[PDB]
Design a protein around this motif. Structure first.
Motif, PDB file in Angstrom:
ATOM      1  N   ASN A   1       0.878  -1.170   0.000  1.00  0.00           N
ATOM      2  CA  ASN A   1       0.000   0.000   0.000  1.00  0.00           C
ATOM      3  C   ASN A   1       0.918   1.223   0.000  1.00  0.00           C
ATOM      4  N   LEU A   2       1.099   1.834  -1.171  1.00  0.00           N
ATOM      5  CA  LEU A   2       2.112   2.866  -1.334  1.00  0.00           C
ATOM      6  C   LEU A   2       1.595   4.277  -1.071  1.00  0.00           C
ATOM      7  N   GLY A   3       0.285   4.471  -0.927  1.00  0.00           N
ATOM      8  CA  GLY A   3      -0.201   5.843  -0.810  1.00  0.00           C
ATOM      9  C   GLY A   3       0.204   6.657  -2.029  1.00  0.00           C
ATOM     10  N   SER A   4       0.630   7.905  -1.782  1.00  0.00           N
ATOM     11  CA  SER A   4       1.063   8.828  -2.829  1.00  0.00           C
ATOM     12  C   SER A   4       2.319   8.364  -3.555  1.00  0.00           C
ATOM     13  N   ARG A   5       3.117   7.479  -2.950  1.00  0.00           N
ATOM     14  CA  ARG A   5       4.328   6.995  -3.604  1.00  0.00           C
ATOM     15  C   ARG A   5       4.028   6.111  -4.806  1.00  0.00           C
ATOM     16  N   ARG A   6       2.790   5.635  -4.943  1.00  0.00           N
ATOM     17  CA  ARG A   6       2.386   4.894  -6.123  1.00  0.00           C
ATOM     18  C   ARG A   6       2.485   5.732  -7.394  1.00  0.00           C
ATOM     19  N   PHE A   7       2.621   7.059  -7.289  1.00  0.00           N
ATOM     20  CA  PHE A   7       2.765   7.909  -8.468  1.00  0.00           C
ATOM     21  C   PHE A   7       4.146   8.533  -8.561  1.00  0.00           C
ATOM     22  N   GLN A   8       5.132   7.959  -7.880  1.00  0.00           N
ATOM     23  CA  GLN A   8       6.490   8.500  -7.855  1.00  0.00           C
ATOM     24  C   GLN A   8       7.469   7.419  -8.296  1.00  0.00           C
ATOM     25  N   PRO A   9       7.469   7.050  -9.593  1.00  0.00           N
ATOM     26  CA  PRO A   9       6.682   7.588 -10.702  1.00  0.00           C
ATOM     27  C   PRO A   9       5.462   6.740 -11.077  1.00  0.00           C
ATOM     28  N   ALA A  10       5.392   5.503 -10.587  1.00  0.00           N
ATOM     29  CA  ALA A  10       4.390   4.548 -11.036  1.00  0.00           C
ATOM     30  C   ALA A  10       4.447   3.339 -10.120  1.00  0.00           C
ATOM     31  N   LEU A  11       3.451   2.461 -10.261  1.00  0.00           N
ATOM     32  CA  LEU A  11       3.451   1.243  -9.457  1.00  0.00           C
ATOM     33  C   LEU A  11       4.564   0.282  -9.879  1.00  0.00           C
ATOM     34  N   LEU A  12       4.742   0.071 -11.181  1.00  0.00           N
ATOM     35  CA  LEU A  12       5.691  -0.920 -11.665  1.00  0.00           C
ATOM     36  C   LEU A  12       5.984  -0.622 -13.128  1.00  0.00           C
ATOM     37  N   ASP A  13       6.915  -1.386 -13.704  1.00  0.00           N
ATOM     38  CA  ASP A  13       7.352  -1.165 -15.082  1.00  0.00           C
ATOM     39  C   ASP A  13       6.798  -2.261 -15.987  1.00  0.00           C
ATOM     40  N   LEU A  14       5.937  -1.848 -16.917  1.00  0.00           N
ATOM     41  CA  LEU A  14       5.285  -2.736 -17.876  1.00  0.00           C
ATOM     42  C   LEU A  14       6.256  -3.222 -18.951  1.00  0.00           C
ATOM     43  N   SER A  15       7.245  -2.402 -19.274  1.00  0.00           N
ATOM     44  CA  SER A  15       8.239  -2.670 -20.299  1.00  0.00           C
ATOM     45  C   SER A  15       9.608  -2.515 -19.662  1.00  0.00           C
ATOM     46  N   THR A  16      10.597  -3.246 -20.185  1.00  0.00           N
ATOM     47  CA  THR A  16      11.937  -3.144 -19.616  1.00  0.00           C
ATOM     48  C   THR A  16      12.681  -1.904 -20.083  1.00  0.00           C
ATOM     49  N   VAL A  17      12.188  -1.214 -21.109  1.00  0.00           N
ATOM     50  CA  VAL A  17      12.895  -0.050 -21.631  1.00  0.00           C
ATOM     51  C   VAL A  17      12.516   1.172 -20.815  1.00  0.00           C
ATOM     52  N   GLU A  18      13.514   1.810 -20.213  1.00  0.00           N
ATOM     53  CA  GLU A  18      13.282   2.913 -19.283  1.00  0.00           C
ATOM     54  C   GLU A  18      13.129   4.231 -20.050  1.00  0.00           C
ATOM     55  N   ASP A  19      12.050   4.292 -20.843  1.00  0.00           N
ATOM     56  CA  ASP A  19      11.703   5.469 -21.638  1.00  0.00           C
ATOM     57  C   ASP A  19      10.798   6.463 -20.910  1.00  0.00           C
ATOM     58  N   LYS A  59       9.339   0.359  11.536  1.00  0.00           N
ATOM     59  CA  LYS A  59      10.127   0.536  10.327  1.00  0.00           C
ATOM     60  C   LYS A  59       9.750   1.838   9.629  1.00  0.00           C
ATOM     61  N   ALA A  60      10.671   2.323   8.790  1.00  0.00           N
ATOM     62  CA  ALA A  60      10.575   3.695   8.295  1.00  0.00           C
ATOM     63  C   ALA A  60       9.489   3.874   7.239  1.00  0.00           C
ATOM     64  N   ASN A  61       9.270   2.893   6.357  1.00  0.00           N
ATOM     65  CA  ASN A  61       8.246   3.058   5.315  1.00  0.00           C
ATOM     66  C   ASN A  61       7.403   1.794   5.279  1.00  0.00           C
ATOM     67  N   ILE A  62       6.373   1.778   6.117  1.00  0.00           N
ATOM     68  CA  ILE A  62       5.529   0.604   6.291  1.00  0.00           C
ATOM     69  C   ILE A  62       4.598   0.488   5.096  1.00  0.00           C
ATOM     70  N   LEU A  63       4.560  -0.695   4.480  1.00  0.00           N
ATOM     71  CA  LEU A  63       3.797  -0.887   3.253  1.00  0.00           C
ATOM     72  C   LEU A  63       2.543  -1.716   3.456  1.00  0.00           C
ATOM     73  N   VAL A  64       2.253  -2.122   4.688  1.00  0.00           N
ATOM     74  CA  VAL A  64       1.082  -2.930   5.002  1.00  0.00           C
ATOM     75  C   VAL A  64       0.060  -2.026   5.682  1.00  0.00           C
ATOM     76  N   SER A  65      -1.219  -2.290   5.435  1.00  0.00           N
ATOM     77  CA  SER A  65      -2.291  -1.486   6.015  1.00  0.00           C
ATOM     78  C   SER A  65      -3.377  -2.414   6.561  1.00  0.00           C
ATOM     79  N   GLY A  66      -4.448  -1.808   7.085  1.00  0.00           N
ATOM     80  CA  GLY A  66      -5.460  -2.582   7.792  1.00  0.00           C
ATOM     81  C   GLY A  66      -6.109  -3.670   6.949  1.00  0.00           C
ATOM     82  N   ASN A  67      -6.415  -3.376   5.685  1.00  0.00           N
ATOM     83  CA  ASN A  67      -7.068  -4.399   4.868  1.00  0.00           C
ATOM     84  C   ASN A  67      -6.192  -5.641   4.687  1.00  0.00           C
ATOM     85  N   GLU A  68      -4.869  -5.465   4.606  1.00  0.00           N
ATOM     86  CA  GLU A  68      -3.978  -6.613   4.449  1.00  0.00           C
ATOM     87  C   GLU A  68      -3.881  -7.419   5.743  1.00  0.00           C
ATOM     88  N   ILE A  69      -3.798  -6.735   6.887  1.00  0.00           N
ATOM     89  CA  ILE A  69      -3.848  -7.429   8.172  1.00  0.00           C
ATOM     90  C   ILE A  69      -5.148  -8.204   8.304  1.00  0.00           C
TER      91      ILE A  69
END
Ligand SMILES: O=c1ccn([C@@H]2O[C@H](COP(=O)(O)OP(=O)(O)O)[C@@H](O)[C@H]2O)c(=O)[nH]1
Ligand SMILES: O=c1ccn([C@@H]2O[C@H](COP(=O)(O)OP(=O)(O)O)[C@@H](O)[C@H]2O)c(=O)[nH]1
Ligand SMILES: *[C@@H]1O[C@H](CO)[C@@H](O)[C@H](O)[C@H]1NC(C)=O
Ligand SMILES: *[C@@H]1O[C@H](CO)[C@@H](O)[C@H](O)[C@H]1NC(C)=O
Lengths: 511, 511
Positions: free
Chosen positions: A55-73, B203-213
């Motif tokens: 659960n990343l909160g706002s960090r999910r947009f810094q820059p994205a959740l994950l990389d769909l392609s291996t090319v870092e474009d 821990k400094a950046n906890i990635l688990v939240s209530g729904n996962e627990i």
């Protein structure tokens, strides 16, 4: 089962569990991930059993959740979803479910054989095999927005089920939901970066080696149905970047190296026949270009000879050098350059992307024409680079032959065992420290040219005491050993100077 | 099939494919990973189809391949193997094959209920569910060297097959080979670190939240067969760290908060009955201790009241505070401290590890006895910490009641859409820039108290132009907008001041 499926989704919502620390190698497993064909967005529905890990909160947009392609474009690289309450489905069209387990991924450039193999096929092969069953069950979904492309037959060999393109999803309904989907491609097999941030070059810490390339190569050879014999293989191009004296080249190589020479091209053979020819070749000669990614099919002991047109520095364009020279590939690599402007033919009047420079430059057309070497640049537009790389080349045959002629294991130790130390006393008040150990358990099964040991001493408190490299399994320290003192001692074994084994548990020694 | 199995191993060797960047969250899938019961070592056999991905070279010992346990103790944390040529099997006993898919892992402290749930059970639950099928098929192998321990019944609920301990493997043969094994535990559900390097804390950046627990909690409740009702639950201990006036405490809480109070302990109820009681409790009162990890079974809206003995600062010991306060847990947390030495009973004559300080200290026994607060320390030995934490406590009831009485969503925006800009001209030579966009696609489905937009302007070249927070979907910039200039423009939407959505594609604007 449609009513049960819709009920699990509307009440429970989406589930997500991912590997990895950051977007660069997070792979995610989803259940009930949906996709709106109108919004062109993936959707995470929050229900009363939804799971989002991490659960990343706002960090999910810094820059994205994950990389769909291996090319870092920084573009088709990124995957994300938008969040909705599961209850919002009351106000949405009824979803169409995808029952197949899906692997969702983006292709950077499906029309270029190097990009296909390095960015997509090798990562797909091992990403699929990270997870039990995917390799025999998954259907690929390519979401980047390209059509089939020139090598779709190759992408088809990786999934057992027919892959789907984003355009074909619009025809399936307004709202699609995947019951089981994996999203993300490992970068672990990559070795090259194409120059978006700094000039193109190998990656800094390559984690793939020859055995991993070869397992992939064998798989492709079987899916292509192609699993005396000394010959040189010249991999020609027929449209651009030509070898102008190819027939004379073939004869000179055959007579010089005393073996048959054969030509191959992508345009005139089936890919299976290309693989058949590359796979038993003793030498592969080719202009720099995407066809040289077939280097990964060469047998052990072969030689790659890569030709570069005028003004193109081989050290700036090393994707096939890097591949050929990976540990365990057991290939030799020779680069040869044309330095003779009389042996180059330029094409300044072609479309800008096929090399032309008349497309529009004033006295810049004149800087390019008079530059003796393409300078370092970034992806992907550079005019001078495309002008020089699409030259045709007459190969100076004596220079090539002389250049070729000039340019012609690895298991690590275990921990040492039963390490012990004894303090001793000599003279009046002088202290000595003897340290001994047994050889690593795996050493008896190996044939190693040089075995040494490295001992690190530390007086408890400050730094270390210069490592001592030894051949024996025992040594007595005298100098800088003081009585009434505690020393921490570490020992590791070293094979052939560079294969550094692990340290054992620290020894605490009292004088 | 024994001959086929032995042939695949002796000729092909071991295969390994792993997720992750570094040892901290690499999970590996192996085929034909072996284990020598005499050497107590895992073995990678190099054969003619062996695959080692990543191929780390010497970095495989800096410090290890991956982490077997989530506790970063630098000891039972680490997994590695030793390498042998597959041909070495000619000189080795014939292997015994393990046909079950295995998950290999280490337990840090199987005798402590907090360590069991936080270090092992929650990580096992989600590590298993990262990979299709493991959750219903895997057998756990615990390699750390401990026996069953006091909570083995709980570890059994996580694998469908009976788990095996390292001691039981010695009885199966000298050389065991796993046909299919996963190795590694995700740290993604962890929230606490026990103080090996810096004092213990979250821990400094906890990635688990209530729904996962809660998903984990529901699973344990079903496997324990336990899936008017307002009551307070006092979680007592019977051996040490006692509440000396428990009966008076129970009566005062019941009368003050006007609801039934009930006691529970690990020693006198089955764990399923513990879970049954915790799961419907409105308030959980307990001395600091491992039984409070059952906080993760509380219903939404409940209150945790954690009691701390004399000289123990609640802000230094926050594993249950951190758990209770995770986003989405929807619990309240109250810490209460005994500051009255007349209400504490020490036990200076117990075994050193159950709190005693006579075990051996001179005038240090006197520093401890006169210290008003245990100072920050590191794991795991500290005498003063164990002395104070094993005190018994008489609770000052008015102080506790007053303390309790004093101390009593989250979906992110999508990208804005169709962002555009128009330059305009006014006065003589004055330039203006208008920027507009549509709301995020998911916004129509939400009920959000405050929606704002943040616009970042940059004159192509230098930094940004102070973000402007706006409520409208259009704004005209006048000041610091110059003609004959290019501006890059970014827009993101913000929910309730802190939920920061993603930026859209940059707009390039020309004045
Ligand atoms: O005469 C030619 C030129 C190109 N190609 C193929 O067409 C694709 C695009 O070629 P491009 O020059 O753009 O890429 P490069 O070879 O520079 O990597 C690649 O897969 C080439 O192998 C080909 O088969 N024949
Ligand atoms: O009177 C007691 C003391 C301890 N324990 C349990 O025994 C284990 C070890 O207790 P310890 O004090 O070592 O750990 P702590 O409670 O400090 O985390 C934990 O699971 C406790 O819940 C228990 O049931 N009753
Ligand atoms: C979610 O709702 C469904 C029915 O509405 C129910 O079966 C399920 O138990 C609910 N779960 C929770 C955690 O409320
Ligand atoms: C490995 O050896 C076996 C038999 O010895 C053979 O079947 C297999 O093809 C070999 N593979 C390679 C790459 O040599």
């Amino acid at each position: 089962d449609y009513p049960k499926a819709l009920q699990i989704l509307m009440e429970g919502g989406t589930h997500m569990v991912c590997t990895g620390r950051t977007h660069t190698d997070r792979i995610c497993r989803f259940k009930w991930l949906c996709y709106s064909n109108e919004a062109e967005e993936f959707i995470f529905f929050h229900g009363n059993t939804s799971v989002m890990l991490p659960n990343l909160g706002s960090r999910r947009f810094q820059p994205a959740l994950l990389d769909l392609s291996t090319v870092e474009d920084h573009n088709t690289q990124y995957f994300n979803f938008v969040e909705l309450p599961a209850a919002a489905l009351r106000f949405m069209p009824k979803p169409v479910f995808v029952p197949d387990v899906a692997l969702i991924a983006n292709r950077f450039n499906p029309d270029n054989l190097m990009h296909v193999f390095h960015d997509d096929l090798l990562p797909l092969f091992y990403t699929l095999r990270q997870f039990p069953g995917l390799a025999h069950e998954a259907r690929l979904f390519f979401m980047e927005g390209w059509g089939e492309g020139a090598h779709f037959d190759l992408y088809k060999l990786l999934s057992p089920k027919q892959p789907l393109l984003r355009a074909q999803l619009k025809t399936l309904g307004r709202l699609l939901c995947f019951s089981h989907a994996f999203v993300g491609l490992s970068k672990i097999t990559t070795w090259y970066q194409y120059g978006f941030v700094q000039p193109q070059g190998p990656k800094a810490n390559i984690l793939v080696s020859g055995n991993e390339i070869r397992q992939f190569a064998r798989f492709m050879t079987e899916k292509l149905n192609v699993s005396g014999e000394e010959y040189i293989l010249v991999f020609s191009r027929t449209q651009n970047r030509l070898i102008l004296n190819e027939a004379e080249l073939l004869l000179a190589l055959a007579q010089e190296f005393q073996m048959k020479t054969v030509t191959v091209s992508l345009e005139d053979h089936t890919f299976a026949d290309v693989v058949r020819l590359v796979s038993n070749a003793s030498m592969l000669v080719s202009m720099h270009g995407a066809q040289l990614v077939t280097t990964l099919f060469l047998p052990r002991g072969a030689t790659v000879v890569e030709l570069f047109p005028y003004a193109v520095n081989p050290d700036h364009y090393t994707p096939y050098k890097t591949l050929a020279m990976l540990p365990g590939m057991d290939l030799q690599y020779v680069a040869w350059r044309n330095m003779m402007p009389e042996n180059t033919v330029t094409h300044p009047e072609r479309p800008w992307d096929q090399g032309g420079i008349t497309h529009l430059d004033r006295a810049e057309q004149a800087r390019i024409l008079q530059s003796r070497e393409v300078p370092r640049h970034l992806c992907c537009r550079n005019p001078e680079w495309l002008f020089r790389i699409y030259q045709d080349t007459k190969v100076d045959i004596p220079s090539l032959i002389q250049t070729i002629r000039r340019v012609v294991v690895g298991l690590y130790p275990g921990k040492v065992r039963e390490a012990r130390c004894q303090a001793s006393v000599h003279g009046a008040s002088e202290a000595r420290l003897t340290v001994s150990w047994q050889i690593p358990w795996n050493l008896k099964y190996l044939k190693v040219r040089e075995v040494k040991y490295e001992v690190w001493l530390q007086e408890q408190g400050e730094n270390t005491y210069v490592p001592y490299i030894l051949a024996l399994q025992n040594h007595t320290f005298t100098e800088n050993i003081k009585p009434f003192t505690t020393y921490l001692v570490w020992v590791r074994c070293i094979f052939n100077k560079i294969l550094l084994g692990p340290f054992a548990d620290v020894l605490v020694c009292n004088t």
